[PDB]
Write a protein that binds this ligand. Structure first.
Ligand code: ATP
Ligand code: MG
Lengths: 92, 117, 432
């Protein structure tokens, strides 16, 4: 049993990697398209989905498990996940 | 770099040695600088380069400047304000459409990005 | 070369200076103009931290390893040459093949003595000294493996002829590298404009990004410096800081007063909170994340700073200065956007012992350079009598909470940089 638990903490990247990849990828794929559908309006009257985005999934539905995906997006930065927070933290 | 400075003083000493002088006169320094400066050739590249970038730098500079004092960042209001700002002492129709194209090309792969100069 | 007999009382005497730290920072590489931060980091490296091994199963070095990565002609080779002069047990080696001693161990018949000798490499010949590696970016695969093993495990493992041994190399590694492409790109991270892998870059406590930019004032100052050097060493006839330089002889002796070890029992909530804040920022921003090794290097630099003052206890100022150095190294190695953001949010940590005059001078240089770029972009060239209003300088000085610019205008440093205050129209301007 102890050996199987030690091995379970390595099935936790055999398998669990895909499971939490799916959990974080729910938010990843939702943020992937809607943050560029409005991208003609990402420079228009409203800059970008600023802080309501975390609250956007709150109403229609986890801050801890969504801020992590937000930082993963913010890690690289090319067009939308960069220019979101380029004007966000400036404009709060 | 500073190696250019050492080369310049080496060339000036060499000019003085050619004339069998005992002091490096400023004429020797002038010749060393002239030789060194002609030796550096320019990188000419194709498209009104050195003029597209000539005003692209001032454009990025103005946007960077207004980034601090104001938090108002749009696409239309800012593009028009930048047009007017550059045209603060100049005006034409083809020039305005030229600046419109330059913004178009620049935004294609940087939308006021976070790069340096 | 060293005796330190009866000479210790004057060492303690100038240790009592309470400004000995700046004197020592000012007394290294006297032949190199500027580069004050590299000088401070090299002084810390020379004194070094405290090696420890809790039990016998957790080994932390006390060596402070410095990596100078800067675009060419910026005195990095000169820095390494100076360090070789000032230290005992310093051996200079190069990433190319242009040196007496190479990084890797080998066994061979010696060319001149004809004796079968184990040529233990440069890393182990400096076992309690300094390994200076120029052209660090130009090493072989096997030189890179040797440096990785020495920097990681602090010993070299030979298994070459019939010799199986692990002879050890506890050196401080000071390296000079050129950036990829011959010019540092501030829009990239440190790791991606230097030809080094992360395992190597992570082994350096201080990463100094040397940066050749055209500043007319510093260009004049450096040109005067080097031309004066060329004048005074003409074979016929055979320096700017608040503090007097210290002669390299008593300085070598002072550094050789590492006979006294050192120890720390000081603050932990400030440091822990600082690392927590650094983590939150560096993982909010998509940046190189601060790690444990950064606080361990900060501890090394605090111990070194305490050793510079002969203290035998880290004091809050040692910790604060180590924080400033660790953060300067960690912040300059980010891409430009992240570098600006971290310069802002951590500025209170980052300006320790950084007086108002130099902060204000930095702001003023920034505005005047902004203005010069604006001028020359559509005026063909920069103009004469480049000027800037009183007001915007006042505004930025408030942004960092100065509010009292009068001493800045009266400063020696203001005058030295070819600046002038024109109170008639609230203008300040440069000559060139
Ligand atoms: N403060 C200074 N900054 C830059 N260069 C200086 C300074 N003081 C002196 N120099 C001169 O600059 C020259 C540059 O040589 P050095 O070998 O130090 O550059 P380097 O950094 O090794 O360049 P590279 O990366 O091309 O090897 C030296 O001959 C030195 O005399
Ligand atoms: Mg060199």
């Amino acid at each position: 049993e102890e050996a199987l638990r030690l091995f379970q903490v390595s099935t936790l990247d055999a398998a669990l990697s895909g499971t939490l990849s799916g959990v974080e990828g729910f938010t990843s794929q939702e943020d992937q398209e809607m943050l560029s559908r409005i991208e003609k309006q990402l420079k228009r009257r409203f800059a970008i989905g600023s802080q309501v985005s975390e609250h956007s999934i709150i109403k229609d539905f986890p801050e801890h498990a969504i801020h992590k995906v937000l930082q993963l997006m913010l890690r690289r930065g090319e067009i939308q996940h960069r220019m979101q927070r380029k004007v966000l933290y400036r404009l709060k | 770099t500073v190696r250019q400075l050492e080369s310049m003083i080496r060339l000036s000493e060499a000019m003085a040695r050619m004339h069998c002088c005992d002091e490096v006169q400023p004429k020797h320094v002038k010749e060393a600088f002239r030789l060194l400066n002609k030796s550096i050739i320019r990188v000419e590249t194709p498209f009104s380069e050195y003029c597209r970038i000539s005003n692209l730098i001032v454009l990025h500079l103005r946007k960077v400047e207004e980034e601090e004092d104001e938090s108002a960042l749009k696409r239309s209001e800012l593009v028009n304000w930048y047009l007017k700002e550059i045209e603060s002492e100049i005006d034409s129709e083809e020039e305005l459409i030229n600046k419109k194209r330059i913004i178009e090309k620049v935004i294609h792969r940087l939308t006021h990005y976070d790069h340096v100069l | 070369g060293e005796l330190t007999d009866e000479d210790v009382k004057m060492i303690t005497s100038l240790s009592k200076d309470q400004q000995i730290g700046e004197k020592i920072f000012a007394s290294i590489a006297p032949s190199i103009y500027g580069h004050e931060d590299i000088k401070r980091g090299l002084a810390l490296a020379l004194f070094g931290g405290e090696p420890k091994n809790p039990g016998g199963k957790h080994k932390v070095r006390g060596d402070i390893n410095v990596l100078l990565c800067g675009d060419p002609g910026t005195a990095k080779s000169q820095f390494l040459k100076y360090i070789e002069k000032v230290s005992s047990r310093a051996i200079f080696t190069t990433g190319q093949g242009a040196s007496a001693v190479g990084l890797t161990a080998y066994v061979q018949r010696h060319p001149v003595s004809r004796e079968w000798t184990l040529e233990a490499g440069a890393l182990v010949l400096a076992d309690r000294g300094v390994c200076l590696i120029d052209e660090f970016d130009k090493m072989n695969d096997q030189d890179r493996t040797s440096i990785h093993e020495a920097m990681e495990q602090q010993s070299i493992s030979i298994s070459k002829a019939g010799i199986v041994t692990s002879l050890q190399a506890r050196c401080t590694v000071i390296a000079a590298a050129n950036p990829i492409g011959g010019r540092y790109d501030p829009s990239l991270t440190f790791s991606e404009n230097v030809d080094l892998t992360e395992p190597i870059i992570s082994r350096f406590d201080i990463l100094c990004v040397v940066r050749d930019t055209v500043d007319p004032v510093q260009d004049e100052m450096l040109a005067r410096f080097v031309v004066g050097s060329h004048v005074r060493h003409h074979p016929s006839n055979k320096g700017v800081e608040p503090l007097p330089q210290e002669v390299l002889k008593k300085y070598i002796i002072y550094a050789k007063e590492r006979v006294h070890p050192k120890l720390n029992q000081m603050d932990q909530d400030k440091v822990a909170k600082m690392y927590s804040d650094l983590r939150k920022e560096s993982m909010a921003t998509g940046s190189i994340p601060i790690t444990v090794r950064h606080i361990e290097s900060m501890i090394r630099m605090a111990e070194a700073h305490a050793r510079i003052h002969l203290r035998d206890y880290v004091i809050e100022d040692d910790v604060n200065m180590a924080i400033r150095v660790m953060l300067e190294s960690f912040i300059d190695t980010q891409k430009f956007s992240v570098m600006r953001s971290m310069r802002k949010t951590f500025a209170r940590y980052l300006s320790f012992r950084r007086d108002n005059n130099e902060l204000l001078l930095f702001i003023l240089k920034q505005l005047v350079a902004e203005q010069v770029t604006y001028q020359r972009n559509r005026f063909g060239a920069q103009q004469d009598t480049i000027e800037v209003p009183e007001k915007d300088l006042v505004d930025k000085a408030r942004q960092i909470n100065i509010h009292n610019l009068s001493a800045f205008y009266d400063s020696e440093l203001f005058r030295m940089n070819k600046f002038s205050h024109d109170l008639k129209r609230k203008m300040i301007l440069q000559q060139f």
